[PDB]
C-alpha cells in the first residue's frame, strides 16, 4: 500500500488537481525515490532539484517543488534514459519476489 502522494497536486487560480509529467531528466532529481498511487495508478514522486530551472546542464521544470514522474517514460526521442528506466524496472520487478 504505497502512500497517496498529495505533493504531486498543483493549485490553479483555488482548485487543486493532480498532475504528473512523463519524461524528466535524470539530473533533475537526487537519490530518494518514492512510489505513490493515485486512484490505483502508480507513479514516482521526488523532490525537485531544478527549482532554478536547470541542473548539470539538463533542463528541469521551473517553479515546481515536488516532481511526479510516470513509472516508465515516453518513447518520443527520449534517447537512452528510457532504456535505463526499462532495465531498472525489470530488475526491481525481479528483486521484488
Amino acid at each position: 500500500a504505497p502512500p497517496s502522494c498529495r505533493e504531486c497536486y498543483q493549485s490553479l487560480h483555488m482548485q487543486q488537481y493532480f498532475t504528473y509529467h512523463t519524461h524528466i531528466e535524470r539530473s533533475c532529481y537526487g537519490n530518494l525515490i518514492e512510489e505513490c498511487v493515485e486512484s490505483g495508478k502508480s507513479y514516482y514522486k521526488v523532490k525537485n532539484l531544478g527549482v532554478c530551472g536547470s541542473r548539470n546542464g539538463a533542463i528541469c521544470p521551473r517553479g515546481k517543488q515536488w516532481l511526479c514522474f510516470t513509472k516508465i517514460g515516453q518513447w518520443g526521442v527520449n534517447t537512452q534514459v528510457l532504456e535505463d528506466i526499462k532495465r531498472e524496472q525489470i530488475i526491481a520487478k525481479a528483486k521484488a519476489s
Binding site: 488537481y17 509529467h21 512523463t22 531528466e25 515516453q74 518513447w75 527520449n78 532504456e83
Partner: protein, 432 residues
C-alpha cells in the same frame, strides 16, 4: 613464408574475425556455465565495459566528422554547379537516394526482421513538429549534446483527462540539426570568395585528422567487438532467436538490394529517355561481376567506365564527368543497408518508432551521401550516425558488423549499377 606475409598484410580482417569468433565462443561458454545465467547486473556492466568504451569513442568521433565532412562536401559542390548537366546529375542522385532509402525502410518495416517474441508515446503531428524544430537548432553549442522533444504533461481536472505538451530540451546529441547547419555553412563558404578556400582547407585538414582517429579506433575495435558480442549473447536469452533474427535481417537487406536494383532503377531508365534498359544491362554484364567479386567501388571504376564507353555508345565526356563524381556520392546500397539496419536495431530492442524518427532516418541517410567524400560511407559509421540521430542503443553495431562481410557485395553491385544507369540516362538526355 608467404602465409605469414599474407597475415601481416591483412592483420585487420584476421583480428576482426578472430575477435567475433572468440566472442561467440565466450558467450556460449559462459551461458553454458551451470544451469543458467546468475551473475548480477553489476557483473553484466563489468563484462560489457569494453564495448561501452568502444561506443563512447565512436560517438566522440561522430561529432567532428558530422560538423566537418558535411561542410567540406557542401563547399566542394562546384563541379556540378557549373553546368546544367551537373545539376541534373545531383538532382537524380538525391531523388534516387531518397526513393531507395524509403523502399528500404518500408521493406524492413513490412518483413519485421526482429520481434518474434503502459509507456506513453508522442503524437504523429507533434513528432513532425519536433523533426522540423530540430532542423534549425536553437543554439549551435547546445546542439552538440542536446536536442528537442515534446515532453507531455497530464492533468486530472476532477475526472477530465487533460494532455498538454511541454517541449523542453531533452539531453542527447542531435545530428540532423548539425548536418543542416554544416550543409548551409558549406554552401555559404562556396558562395564566398577566395577566403572560402582557406577556411575549407582548414575544415578538410580537421576532417582528415579525425579520419586518422577513425583508423586508429577501427584498429582497436576487435576486442570491443568481442566483448559486445559476448555481452549480447549473455543478456539476450534464446541465442537461436538472435541468430535467426540476424539471418532474417540479412535476407531482408539482400531482398531490398534486389528489388531496388532490378525494379526501381530499370523503372527510372524506362521513364527518362524511354527505351529498354535490359540492353544496357547485358552490355555492362562485365563490370557488375567485377564489382560483386572485388566489392570495391573505386577499384572497378576505370574498368567499368571503359566498358561503358566501348559497349553500346556514350558521349564519353558525360561519362568522364559523372563516373568519378558519382562513384562516391550515390551510395544506393549504403542507403538500403543503413535504413534496414536502423529498423532492425530499433526492432531488436522492442523500441517503437514514430513518423518523425522514420523521416529523420531517411534524411540523415541521404545527407550522409553528400559528405561521403570525406567519410567511409557504406559501413557501420553512417549507421552509427543514424543511430545517434534517432536515439537508440548501439550495442548491435558489432552484431551488424559480423554480417557486413556478407551483405556488402550486393551493396557495391547495386551502387555501380545505379551510377551506370544514371550516366546512361543523362547521356541520352544530353544527346537529344
Amino acid at each position: 613464408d608467404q602465409v605469414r606475409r599474407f597475415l601481416r598484410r591483412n592483420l585487420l580482417v584476421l583480428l576482426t574475425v578472430s575477435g567475433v569468433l572468440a566472442g561467440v565462443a565466450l558467450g556460449l561458454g559462459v551461458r553454458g556455465a551451470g544451469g543458467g545465467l546468475a551473475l548480477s547486473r553489476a557483473q553484466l556492466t563489468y563484462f560489457a565495459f569494453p564495448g561501452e568504451l568502444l561506443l563512447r569513442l565512436l560517438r566522440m568521433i561522430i561529432l567532428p566528422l558530422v560538423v566537418c565532412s558535411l561542410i567540406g562536401g557542401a563547399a566542394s559542390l562546384d563541379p556540378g554547379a557549373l553546368g546544367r548537366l551537373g545539376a541534373w546529375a545531383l538532382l537524380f542522385f538525391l531523388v534516387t537516394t531518397l526513393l531507395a532509402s524509403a523502399l528500404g525502410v518500408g521493406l524492413a518495416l513490412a518483413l519485421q526482421p526482429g520481434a518474434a517474441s503502459n509507456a506513453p508515446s508522442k503524437e504523429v503531428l507533434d513528432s513532425f513538429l519536433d523533426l522540423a524544430r530540430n532542423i534549425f537548432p536553437s543554439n549551435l553549442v547546445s546542439a552538440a549534446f542536446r536536442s528537442y522533444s515534446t515532453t507531455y504533461e497530464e492533468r486530472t481536472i476532477t475526472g477530465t483527462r487533460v494532455k498538454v505538451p511541454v517541449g523542453q530540451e531533452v539531453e542527447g546529441m542531435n545530428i540532423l540539426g548539425l548536418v543542416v547547419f554544416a550543409i548551409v555553412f558549406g554552401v555559404a563558404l562556396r558562395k564566398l570568395g577566395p577566403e572560402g578556400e582557406e577556411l575549407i582547407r582548414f575544415f578538410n585538414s580537421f576532417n582528415e585528422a579525425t579520419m586518422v582517429l577513425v583508423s586508429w579506433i577501427m584498429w582497436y575495435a576487435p576486442v570491443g567487438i568481442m566483448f559486445l558480442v559476448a555481452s549480447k549473447i549473455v543478456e539476450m536469452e534464446d541465442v537461436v532467436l538472435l541468430f535467426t533474427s540476424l539471418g532474417k535481417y540479412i535476407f531482408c537487406c539482400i531482398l531490398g538490394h534486389a528489388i531496388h536494383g532490378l525494379i526501381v532503377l530499370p523503372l527510372i531508365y524506362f521513364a527518362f529517355t524511354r527505351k529498354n534498359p535490359y540492353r544496357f544491362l547485358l552490355g555492362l554484364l562485365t563490370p557488375l561481376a567485377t564489382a560483386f567479386g572485388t566489392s570495391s567501388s573505386s577499384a572497378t571504376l576505370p574498368l567499368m567506365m571503359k566498358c561503358v564507353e566501348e559497349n553500346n555508345g556514350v558521349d564519353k565526356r558525360i561519362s568522364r564527368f559523372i563516373l568519378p563524381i558519382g562513384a562516391t556520392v550515390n551510395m544506393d546500397g549504403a542507403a538500403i543497408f543503413q535504413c534496414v539496419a536502423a529498423v532492425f536495431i530499433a526492432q531488436l530492442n522492442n523500441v517503437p518508432l514514430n513518423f518523425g524518427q522514420i523521416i529523420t532516418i531517411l534524411v540523415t541517410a541521404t545527407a550522409s551521401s553528400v559528405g561521403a567524400a570525406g567519410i567511409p560511407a557504406g559501413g557501420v559509421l553512417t549507421l552509427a550516425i543514424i543511430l545517434e540521430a534517432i536515439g537508440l542503443p548501439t550495442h548491435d553495431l558489432s552484431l551488424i558488423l559480423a554480417v557486413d562481410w556478407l551483405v556488402d557485395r550486393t551493396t557495391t553491385v547495386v551502387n555501380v549499377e545505379g551510377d551506370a544507369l544514371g550516366a546512361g540516362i543523362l547521356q541520352h538526355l544530353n544527346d537529344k
